């Protein structure tokens, strides 16, 4: 019982946090895009695309993608997992992160990788 | 009398990508399109974000972004141009392309740059 935060709530807090950080002289928020029936599919909209797009290359990666879950009792779907694998294979940092604190932590760690070098990973294995 | 709509232009480009291959699968699989207003903005939706996201790094670029216009008489908004500048600055290939043929030609030239080398420009 007692429900946790909704996913909309988790994402909104993360965005509000990003408005208070800076990257290259502007709010980090400016570098974050959220990609929110049959027509959309033929228009190219991909089911299970990660919630957050961060268009900055750092360390080993060409960009950052985050699939947000509201808490630890929510799980990525097969389409989300497949899209994450496709992104990783193409050299993007693409991860599931659950809850506000973990999403913020990933964004912090990603930026902290430093300038693109094609080498520095988020984790030992990925 | 009116030319093609932007929806129709984008759909033809997507249908074209379905018939192209990249690393064993349709090029279409690598293309993403991101489609009250206040809520979406505080959720992080950026007005003026390019229509087409291609999550492949080629030549000098970390990825490809295309702002589509339906024909030669249509032009980028200030927000669209600002986003394009931000993308280019971070090492993405970000362009305005107008009409079906030009959009397809940009995708063709981008893929042809080859594997990411950090130097080969469009
Ligand atoms: Mg999610
Ligand atoms: Mg457009």
Author numbering:
A (entry chain E): 4 to 39, 59 to 148
B (entry chain A): 5 to 39, 58 to 144
Q: Mind quoting what the paper says about this structure?
A:
However, we were able to solve the first VRR-Nuc domain structures using single-domain proteins derived from three bacteria and bacteriophage as surrogates: Psychrobacter (psNUC); Streptococcus equi bacteriophage P9 (stNUC); and Salmonella enteritidis typing phage 3 (saNUC). Crystal structures of three representatives show that they structurally resemble Holliday junction resolvases (HJRs), are dimeric in solution, and are able to cleave symmetric four-way junctions. DALI searches show that the structures with greatest similarity to the VRR-Nuc domains are all Holliday-junction-resolving enzymes exemplified by Hjc. As dimers, bacterial VRR-Nuc domains have two active sites and a DNA-binding surface with 2-fold symmetry that are well suited to the recognition and symmetrical, bilateral cleavage of Holliday junctions.
psNUC was solved by SAD and refined against 2.0 Å resolution data. Here, the crystals contain six molecules per AU, comprising three dimers that, like those of saNUC and stNUC, form around a central hydrophobic β sheet interface. In particular, the linker between β1-β2 forms a partially structured extension over the active site surface. Hexacoordination of a magnesium ion is seen at each active site, involving the E-PD-EXK motif and two water molecules in a configuration stabilized by the conserved Q102. The active site surface is bounded by a ring of positively charged residues to allow substrate recognition. PsNUC bound a four-way DNA junction stoichiometrically with an affinity indicative of a subnanomolar equilibrium dissociation constant (KD) typical of HJRs (∼1 nM; White et al., 1997) whereas stNUC bound the junction over 100 times more weakly (KD = 200 nM). We next investigated the catalytic activity of the VRR-Nuc domains toward these DNA substrates. Figure 3C shows the cleavage products obtained with psNUC and Jbm5, a four-way junction that can undergo 12 steps of branch migration such that each possible dinucleotide can be accommodated at the branchpoint (Kvaratskhelia et al., 2001). psNUC therefore not only structurally resembles an archaeal HJR but also behaves as one, displaying binding to and symmetrical cutting of HJ substrates with affinities and cleavage patterns typical of a canonical HJC protein.
